[PDB]
Design a protein around this ligand. Structure first.
Ligand SMILES: *P(=O)(O)OCC(C)(C)[C@@H](O)C(=O)NCCC(=O)NCCS
Lengths: 50, 50, 72, 134, 49
DNA sequence: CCACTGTTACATTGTAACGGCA
DNA sequence: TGCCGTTACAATGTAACAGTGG
């Protein structure tokens, strides 16, 4: 219980940040790889719009 | 000897009584703030569960 | 009457109004009060009537009507 | 140290206290000449919304004789601010007719207890007398 | 602790009751032994005569 | 009836005096 | 000693109740 409690705040802040970031986008993220493909799509949209 | 323990039980009872008023007053105060903050404030803005 | 206590306190503990609570419904799920909220509700009921309610009796108040059933 | 001190709160308290005293006519500053006192008071007035500089203002222009009064006023303000959160820690103020207060204070001084302790003991004895009779 | 103290009070009551019973038994035995001592004295006197 | 007065029970802020403690 | 909690006040402001007479 104490180990999980120590881990908790970091995980909770991470979850909140991730939820805000994904909701800002139309997509919801679920994996590190998925974040990487989102970055690739971001780069594609950037290189187009420029 | 046991009458002393009975008196200690009475002391614990009064302490419980006190904690109980504290808790009920806290919930009474909470009620209204929940009711107002349910205008999207509590959804994610105020409730920084971190 | 004396039930005005319960039907008042309940609302004051759950955010609903006097008429919102329905006797057929249940506090646990039909009022939105979770475990902690129901504990707070039962403990406020205990405080109001200056009495005591053990755990066993206290657990049988999940429904609206029970709050008066043990009282009266 | 029992109550933690918060700068942005105690500094606002100090600013409000000094403004109140100035409005009341108290000489806030150590400058007898009216021009310097008025200039310092204007500096304070425009100094609102600043803890880190109201503290320095106090260090530099504050009247020497008001330091103790301000310190004890802030002590009381801090204690009351922290105690006003919970019901059991709050304090209830009442007015007692002079004879009753005189007798109660006589008892309290005689027994070495405070007013609260003396009244608690007396009420407990009254209850005990009731039980004795009953 | 409240239930424990109430139960200990009940146990105390029971032991107090049984010791009251023993006190009554002691009183009865005291009467009987008074009679016995009287008998002893009578027998002593009869032997002397 | 209605208004005005007297009184009690608080709150609010400020202050002086003790006593604990580094 | 100087800070810090703590007590016992003082002064003023308010709400609420009870009276009084027009
Ligand atoms: P729920 O997620 O609202 O949590 C409720 C609770 C675990 C915090 C607690 O209030 C509760 O309901 N406990 C059940 C009763 C209990 O544990 N009683 C112990 C008596 S010593």
């Amino acid at each position: 219980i104490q180990s999980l409690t120590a881990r908790a705040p970091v995980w909770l802040a991470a979850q909140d940040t991730l939820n805000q970031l994904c909701e800002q986008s139309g997509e919801t993220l679920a994996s590190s790889n998925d974040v990487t493909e989102y970055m690739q799509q971001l780069l594609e949209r950037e290189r187009e719009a420029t | 000897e046991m009458e002393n323990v009975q008196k200690k039980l009475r002391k614990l009872e009064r302490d419980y009584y006190q904690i109980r008023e504290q808790v009920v007053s806290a919930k009474a105060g909470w009620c209204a703030v929940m009711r107002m903050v349910k205008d999207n404030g509590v959804e994610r803005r105020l409730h920084r569960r971190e | 009457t004396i039930e005005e206590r319960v039907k008042k306190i309940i609302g004051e503990q759950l955010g609903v109004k006097q008429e919102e609570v329905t006797n057929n419904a249940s506090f646990v799920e039909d009022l939105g009060a979770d475990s902690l909220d129901t504990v707070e509700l039962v403990m406020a009921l205990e405080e109001e009537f200056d009495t005591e309610i053990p755990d066993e009796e206290a657990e049988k108040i999940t429904t609206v009507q029970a709050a008066i059933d043990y009282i009266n | 140290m029992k109550y933690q001190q918060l700068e942005n709160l105690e500094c606002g308290w100090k600013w409000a206290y000094l403004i109140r005293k100035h409005q009341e006519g108290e000489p806030i500053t150590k400058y007898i000449e009216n021009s310097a006192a008025h200039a310092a008071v204007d500096k304070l007035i425009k100094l609102e919304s600043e803890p880190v500089r109201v503290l320095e203002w106090i260090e530099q222009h504050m009247n020497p004789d008001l330091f103790n009064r301000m310190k004890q006023t802030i002590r009381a303000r801090r204690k009351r601010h922290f105690n006003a959160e919970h019901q059991h820690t709050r304090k209830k103020s009442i007015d007692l007719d002079f004879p009753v207060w005189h007798r109660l204070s006589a008892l309290s001084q005689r027994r070495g207890n405070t007013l609260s302790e003396t009244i608690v003991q007396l009420i407990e004895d009254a209850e005990r007398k009731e039980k004795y009779a009953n | 602790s409240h239930k424990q103290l109430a139960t200990e009070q009940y146990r105390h009551v029971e032991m107090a009751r049984e010791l009251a019973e023993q006190s009554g038994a002691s009183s009865d035995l005291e009467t009987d032994h008074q009679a016995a001592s009287d008998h002893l004295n009578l027998v002593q006197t009869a032997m002397r005569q």
